[PDB]
């Protein structure tokens, strides 16, 4: 691929560098349009700026804490972190969110990597060999209320068992109801004065419920579960203005009141360098 | 002969002329078209009320003063009371439409100022309350009057900071969206042809706004001395390749 | 079974390793692709779209006036603006080019710098737009500036000049992070003649400045950006 053509002196009526940006078109003006150039070659295909590569590496999307402890006399196993569940979203952690929100619509298969790490902060004396269940819970599937109830037997829910310390790995196809996920949705679920703006089921990717399969030890064990997401077979539409302000919420474009200026102020006037 | 400044757009019984145009934008180089059968899922035979709805509808004119921040309209919401298009929008469960948008602002060769005219697909607005506060239905559905970005914040309404595009992205980066400038020196009209842009083939028209039109002063209006310090801006919108599916009773929306 | 030795890195999770993995949803049939306009295949497409530069970042608050470069009538020979060309920094940091460039470590190729004049139609100005290639200072008196790559812009019926900043570097790639060895040089604008306003018009007129990339533009070594940040995870 030619990067620049050879070009010499011009004295001409064809003036490529004058245009009208009122038209909303940016003209493809080359350096050979206004300086004398030599011939150079690209040696460059642009592969690492493909949207398959730009959105196609594993990003941490959720960190959650579950505990292995004695569950006798515990009323609310959810509140005691005997299990935990997570509505799967790619907007809770903001480095991946800003990349996805360069586009309006995005279609991809998902690849999940789930890392579980343990710690015993208070007076343990051994190695707890623990197994984590991670259960993909679609909408309308029964959600767990106990860490050991009937819902964890996974007769139709996909679940994965893996040891604490090593990881899990599975792919999930594109499960959007529409042809792509909506990163942005200027609307409502229905016509109603009170109903929520922006949050739509058009980017629902499922839900994961996590528990420790082991009963309990003498000591407590805290398990941090880190879910990493990698998009693949990515298709993206409608490029957008990039996020400039801090995010405040999942599924909403709200930015905080009294934010710091995002455009840096010069150490001088407009003539400074 | 062939001049880029002199344009005629005829849809239905409506015609727009301009003698000071700047070469209409077709968004993403895609002319609006009807839904093909290979993309369709809804089994209903669609109604195509061609000349009765695919015509220019003129909204109320705004007044661009020297302290104006800008204006935002939602589509199809800005046309919800416009003739037969507004009636079909509430009687049908489903509908898809492209648009020809024509923003008009003339002045003299003594005036200066520049309007950005931009179409934003899925312009999900931010609340001014921050946090997880929603924006209520009556604020994202203002109708023909649109949203005045110099008006004050209201409870349940959007944030109206024009520098952050009402969504937390900077004003200078709106040019990735399809746009034209109305630079008063150069042109008095902007024309943007919008195809139907959505992740679904056809959609509900009252609960969802597909695109938003923003008209934003960038270079502020400077009038010659002694002249009236304001200019009118007129928006005229024509739906095109308009389909409606799922006829039933008329929807009742908050209004 | 077949005998096997296991290599270093076994059991590691490398976040950029692209391997096949079992589907949690066997026999699932995803929604049909419909045609949607504006499909993006590569980010090098959309950095060729010009966005506005907040060149007048002299205010203590983000505002629309930060995009407006002021011109003054009775000024000969003087500077209109200046900037360095660290495109992951300064006035370029919030532009679309600068924000995509901050996802990468290395950049190369030519930049497209545009100025749109927005004054009255009965006004006239000639400006000079100078690129100073690196190894010299930012120019100080327009005589220094025109010794480098420059354009004399006559403002007329066509309101927009396009100054390509040509790739002027010995090293094949520059850092997107500001680095002195890979500094890209300086951009400056000067009154070539002056701004002449018509009668009954007064005050300042404004330039709008635009940045995009030429199609020779190269971008590599993907990295995190510092622009977005958080302290805690976000919730519903």
């Amino acid at each position, epitope marked *: 691929t030619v990067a620049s053509i050879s070009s010499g002196p011009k004295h001409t009526q064809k003036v490529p560098i004058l245009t009208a940006n009122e038209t909303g078109a940016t003209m493809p003006v080359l350096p050979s349009d206004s300086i004398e150039t030599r011939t150079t070659y690209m040696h460059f295909n642009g592969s690492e700026t493909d949207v398959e590569c730009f959105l196609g590496r594993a990003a941490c999307v959720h960190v959650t804490e579950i505990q292995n402890k004695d569950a006798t006399g515990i009323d609310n196993h959810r509140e005691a972190k005997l299990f935990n569940d997570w509505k799967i979203n790619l907007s809770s952690l903001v480095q991946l969110r800003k990349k996805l929100e360069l586009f309006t619509y995005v279609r991809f298969d998902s690849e999940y990597t789930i890392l579980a790490t343990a710690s015993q902060p208070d007076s343990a004396n051994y190695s707890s060999n623990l197994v984590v269940q991670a259960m993909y819970v679609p909408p309308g599937a029964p959600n767990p209320k106990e860490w050991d109830d009937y819902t964890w037997q996974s007769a139709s829910n996909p679940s994965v068992f893996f040891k604490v310390g090593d990881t899990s790995r599975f792919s999930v196809p594109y499960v959007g109801l529409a042809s792509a996920y909506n990163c942005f949705y200027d609307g409502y679920s229905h016509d109603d004065a009170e109903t929520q703006y922006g949050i739509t089921v058009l980017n629902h990717m499922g839900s994961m419920a996590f528990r420790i399969v082991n009963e309990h030890d003498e000591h407590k064990t805290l398990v941090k579960i880190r879910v990493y997401h990698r998009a693949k077979h990515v298709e993206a539409w409608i490029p957008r203005a990039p996020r400039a302000l801090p995010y405040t919420s999942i599924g909403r474009t709200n930015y905080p009141k009294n934010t710091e200026p995002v455009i840096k102020k010069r150490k001088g*006037d407009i003539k400074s360098y | 002969g062939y001049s880029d400044r002199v344009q005629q757009i005829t849809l239905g019984n409506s015609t727009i002329t301009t003698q000071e145009a700047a070469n209409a934008v077709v968004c993403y180089a895609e002319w609006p078209e009807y839904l093909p059968d290979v993309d369709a899922s809804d089994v209903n035979k669609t109604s195509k009320p061609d000349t009765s709805v695919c015509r220019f509808y003129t909204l109320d004119s705004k007044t661009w003063t020297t302290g104006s921040k800008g204006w935002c309209w939602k589509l199809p919401d800005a046309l919800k009371d416009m003739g037969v298009f507004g009636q079909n929008m509430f009687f049908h469960s489903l509908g898809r439409s492209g648009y020809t948008v024509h923003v008009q602002c003339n002045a003299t060769k003594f005036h200066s100022g520049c309007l950005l005219v931009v179409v934003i697909p899925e312009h999900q607005l931010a609340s001014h309350e921050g946090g997880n506060v929603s924006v209520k239905y009556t604020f994202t559905h203002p109708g023909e009057r649109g949203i005045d970005l110099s008006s004050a914040n209201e409870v349940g309404g959007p944030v109206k900071d024009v520098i952050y595009n009402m969504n937390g992205t900077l004003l200078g980066n709106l040019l990735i969206f399809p746009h034209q400038f109305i630079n008063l020196r150069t042109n008095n009209t902007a024309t943007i042809v919008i195809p139907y842009i959505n992740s679904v083939p056809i959609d509900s028209m009252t609960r969802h706004n597909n695109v938003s039109l923003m008209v934003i002063p960038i270079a*502020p209006l400077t009038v010659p001395t002694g002249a009236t310090p304001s200019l009118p801006i007129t928006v005229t919108i024509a739906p095109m390749c308009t389909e409606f599916s799922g006829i039933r009773s008329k929807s009742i929306v908050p209004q | 079974g077949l005998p096997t030795t296991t290599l270093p890195g076994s059991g590691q999770f490398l976040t950029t390793d692209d391997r096949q993995s079992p589907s949690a949803l066997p026999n699932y049939e995803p929604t049909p692709r419909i045609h949607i306009p504006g499909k993006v295949h590569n980010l090098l497409e959309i950095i060729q779209v010009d966005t506005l530069i907040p060149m007048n970042n002299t*205010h203590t608050k983000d505002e629309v006036n930060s995009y407006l470069i*002021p011109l003054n009538a009775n000024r*000969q020979n003087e*500077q209109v603006f200046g900037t360095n060309l660290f495109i992951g920094d300064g006035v370029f940091k919030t532009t679309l080019l600068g924000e995509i460039v901050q996802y990468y470590t290395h950049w190369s190729g030519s930049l497209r710098f545009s100025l749109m004049y927005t004054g009255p139609a009965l006004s006239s100005a000639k400006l000079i737009l100078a690129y100073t290639p690196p190894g010299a200072r930012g120019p*100080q*008196d327009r005589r220094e500036a025109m010794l480098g790559t420059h354009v004399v812009w006559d403002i007329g019926l066509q309101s927009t000049i396009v100054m390509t900043i040509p790739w002027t570097s010995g090293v094949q790639f520059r850092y997107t992070d500001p680095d002195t060895y890979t500094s890209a040089g300086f951009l400056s604008c000067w009154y070539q003649t002056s701004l002449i306003l018509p009668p009954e018009t007064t*005050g*300042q007129v404004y330039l709008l400045s635009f940045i995009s990339a030429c199609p020779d533009f190269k971008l590599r070594l993907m990295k995190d950006t510092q622009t977005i940040s958080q302290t805690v995870a976000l919730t519903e």
Partner: antibody
Amino acid sequence: AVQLAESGPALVAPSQALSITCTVAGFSLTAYGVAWVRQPPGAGLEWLGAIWAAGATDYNAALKSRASIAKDNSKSQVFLAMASLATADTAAYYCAREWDAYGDYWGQGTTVTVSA
Amino acid sequence: DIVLTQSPAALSAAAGATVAATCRASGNIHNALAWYQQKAGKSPQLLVYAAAALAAGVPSRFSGSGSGTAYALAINSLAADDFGAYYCQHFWSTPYTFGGGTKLEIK
């Protein structure tokens, strides 16, 4: 440090030309304009004029025939020369420089009095 | 020609009260206004530029507001260094005329 220093004769007769020199320091006169402002004792600031960074000047609409500003880029000196001083020209005269297209870094000022 | 009309000529209040000088112009300034304070026997000091931005070394009590033709310097909870002169000056389209002036003297 950026400093502008006024230097005047501090006593002038009427129908005699005033000549005030503005020695500047810490910047070039090829890069920044210089503003002149006077203040009669008791009354408010009045803008006299400005020589811009490359030699163009603007003045009072009322004192345009009566005042002239020039500079020397080699001596770093800006000159305010007013002719035919009436009694209204008794003031403390100040120098400023261009800053974000405005005026600041005002020097201590020289006091000018004119009488018989 | 643009003339600035500043009100009021005198304000008298205690330390901790809030004053508000008002600046009006004969034509639109597009926020190209500065505010100056001047002590007795002292050069003027730039405090507000572009009608809203505080200068260097200016405390957060001073807040410049206003746009178009009407402009306002507001001092919230006056400290002891706030007394003296206050002047408008527009920097849109030479001549760069001043306002009349506003005094702060102790109640």
